[PDB]
Amino acid sequence: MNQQKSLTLIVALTTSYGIGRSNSLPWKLKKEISYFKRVTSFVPTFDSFESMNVVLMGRKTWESIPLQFRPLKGRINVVITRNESLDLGNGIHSAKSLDHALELLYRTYGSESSVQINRIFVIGGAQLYKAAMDHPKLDRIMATIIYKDIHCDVFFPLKFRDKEWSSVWKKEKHSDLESWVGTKVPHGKINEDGFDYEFEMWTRDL
Numbered sequence: 147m148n149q150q151k152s153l154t155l156i157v158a159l160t161t162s163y164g165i166g167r168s169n170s171l172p173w174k175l176k177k178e179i180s181y182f183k184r185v186t187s188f189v190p191t192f193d194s195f196e197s198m199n200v201v202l203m204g205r206k207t208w209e210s211i212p213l214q215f216r217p218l219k220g221r222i223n224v225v226i227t228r229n230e231s232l233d234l235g236n237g238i239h240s241a242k243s244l245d246h247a248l249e250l251l252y253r254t255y256g257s258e259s260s261v262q263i264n265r266i267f268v269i270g271g272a273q274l275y276k277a278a279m280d281h282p283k284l285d286r287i288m289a290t291i292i293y294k295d296i297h298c299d300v301f302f303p304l305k306f307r308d309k310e311w312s313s314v315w316k317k318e319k320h321s322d323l324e325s326w327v328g329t330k331v332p333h334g335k336i337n338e339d340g341f342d343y344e345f346e347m348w349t350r351d352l
């Protein structure tokens with residue numbers, strides 16, 4: 147009664163698995179953010195009458211996002227942090243672990259609640275990504291690959307695109323990415339600001 151959905155991780159990362167610098171992103175990509183927004187917000191139309199997605203994030207990611215952009219708009223935010231500390235949010239949820247967030251979500255958004263959960267995303271940062279990679283329900287990574295070894299000080303925790311992980315994690319066809327995300331998605335290299343990047347979807351078997 148708690149294991150009733152897969153998790154999806156969404157991340158932008160360099161070819162060296164770099165995700166962050168000096169507690170922020172070290173690139174400026176508005177289209178890449180709009181992608182993150184489309185994907186994390188997308189609900190099939192028939193369901194969209196009553197259903198919403200969830201974004202789970204570490205408290206350091208929470209702080210990292212500019213004040214203007216919180217909570218992240220038409221999704222259910224849950225911030226994961228290990229001491230019932232002092233957050234202070236407009237209906238904004240707190241849990242001490244990934245599984246405690248899941249239980250809090252299923253208790254709050256039940257068979258009867260007006261709002262119903264479609265998909266659940268883990269949106270960072272490295273510490274929460276590491277918990278999600280270890281979680282038996284994670285089966286999908288939405289990766290934006292950034293083809294530049296931009297200096298980072300925080301890294302994604304498991305080299306899921308490298309040969310050692312290649313019997314577990316498989317890159318899907320672009321048409322399957324678009325089928326999952328519900329829209330046409332740019333295919334191949336996109337250039338904003340001196341770097342190529344591209345959108346990928348990886349899966350593993352549960």
Ligand SMILES: NC(=O)C1=CN([C@@H]2O[C@H](COP(=O)(O)OP(=O)(O)OC[C@H]3O[C@@H](n4cnc5c(N)ncnc54)[C@H](OP(=O)(O)O)[C@@H]3O)[C@@H](O)[C@H]2O)C=CC1
Nearest residue numbers: 157158166170204205206207227228270271272273274277
């Ligand atoms: N490129 C991308 O797509 C993304 C990049 N980022 C970047 O990542 C950096 C943040 O990464 P990181 O430093 O790991 O920060 P995290 O966001 O993972 O936050 C870490 C804090 O969240 C809490 N936490 C995380 N995992 C758990 C867990 N399993 N159980 C309990 N509490 C947990 C802890 O809080 P406490 O200390 O409260 O106990 C921990 O100290 C920033 O640079 C941000 O810009 C973030 C998201 C996406």
Ligand SMILES: CCOC(=O)CCCCCOc1ccc(OC)c(Cc2cnc3nc(N)nc(N)c3c2C)c1
Nearest residue numbers: 156157158178179182183210211212214215269270290
């Ligand atoms: C109120 C007006 O709102 C508007 O007009 C719309 C602006 C939309 C901004 C909100 O979305 C943002 C904004 C900034 C961010 O860090 C600056 C992030 C964190 C981020 C970014 N890329 C990301 N990209 C990927 N592939 N994955 C992530 N996990 C991710 C993550 C967590 C998200």
